[PDB]
């Protein structure tokens, strides 16, 4: 539960930052989040080049995106991560369909394998 609450707080910070138009915003979590998001906009390394700042922000956005129900969400990376998660769900569904279609005798064999 501890890490879940930590993630929850950080998601709250990201959600606020994403919709905050006050350059004079006094919330330190907002100021910090805006700097991190600005970094990700220009970074050439990104996650595959090993950038810890990008990896941390995208991981946070992914935890947000998993539960996000907003079609025009302003959170950085949210829409794009939801697209990736939808594709993964489709692939999982296609796999499951093929497995169910393989039939009773197959499933029974596997169950007792
Ligand atoms: Zn703010
Ligand atoms: Zn980066
Ligand atoms: Zn979102």
Curated annotation (Swiss-Prot):
Zn finger (TAZ-type) start-end: 1-81
Mod. after translation: Acetylated on Lys at up to 17 positions by intermolecular autocatalysis.
The organism's place on the tree of life at top rank: Eukaryota
Locations listed in the record: Cytoplasm; Nucleus; Chromosome
Subunit architecture: Interacts with HIF1A; the interaction is stimulated in response to hypoxia and inhibited by CITED2. Probably part of a complex with HIF1A and CREBBP. Interacts (via N-terminus) with TFAP2A (via N-terminus); the interaction requires CITED2. Interacts (via CH1 domain) with CITED2 (via C-terminus). Interacts with CITED1 (unphosphorylated form preferentially and via C-terminus). Interacts with ESR1; the interaction is estrogen-dependent and enhanced by CITED1. Interacts with HIPK2. (Microbial infection) Interacts with human adenovirus 5 E1A protein; this interaction stimulates the acetylation of RB1 by recruiting EP300 and RB1 into a multimeric-protein complex.
Free-text note on domains in this protein's UniProt record: The CRD1 domain (cell cycle regulatory domain 1) mediates transcriptional repression of a subset of p300 responsive genes; it can be de-repressed by CDKN1A/p21WAF1 at least at some promoters. It contains sumoylation and acetylation sites and the same lysine residues may be targeted for the respective modifications. It is proposed that deacetylation by SIRT1 allows sumoylation leading to suppressed activity.
Functional note: Functions as a histone acetyltransferase and regulates transcription via chromatin remodeling. Acetylates all four core histones in nucleosomes. Histone acetylation gives an epigenetic tag for transcriptional activation. Mediates acetylation of histone H3 at 'Lys-122' (H3K122ac), a modification that localizes at the surface of the histone octamer and stimulates transcription, possibly by promoting nucleosome instability. Mediates acetylation of histone H3 at 'Lys-18' and 'Lys-27' (H3K18ac and H3K27ac, respectively). (Microbial infection) In case of HIV-1 infection, it is recruited by the viral protein Tat. Regulates Tat's transactivating activity and may help inducing chromatin remodeling of proviral genes. Binds to and may be involved in the transforming capacity of the adenovirus E1A protein.
Disease in which the protein is involved: Defects in EP300 may play a role in epithelial cancer. Chromosomal aberrations involving EP300 may be a cause of acute myeloid leukemias. Translocation t(8;22)(p11;q13) with KAT6A.
Name under which the protein is recorded: Histone acetyltransferase p300
Lineage: Eukaryota, Metazoa, Chordata, Craniata, Vertebrata
Boundaries of the shown chain within the full protein: 1729 to 1818 of 2414
């Amino acid at each position: 539960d501890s890490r879940r609450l930590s993630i929850q707080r950080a998601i709250q910070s990201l959600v606020h930052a994403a919709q905050c138009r006050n350059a004079n915003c006094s919330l330190p979590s907002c100021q910090k989040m805006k700097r991190v998001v600005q970094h990700t906009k220009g970074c050439k390394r990104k996650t595959n080049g090993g950038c810890p700042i990008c990896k941390q922000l995208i991981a946070l956005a992914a935890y947000h995106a998993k539960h996000c129900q907003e079609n025009k969400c302003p959170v950085p990376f949210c829409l794009n991560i939801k697209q990736k998660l939808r594709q993964q769900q489709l692939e999982a569904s296609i796999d499951l369909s093929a497995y169910i279609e393989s039939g009773e005798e197959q499933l029974l064999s596997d169950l007792f394998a």
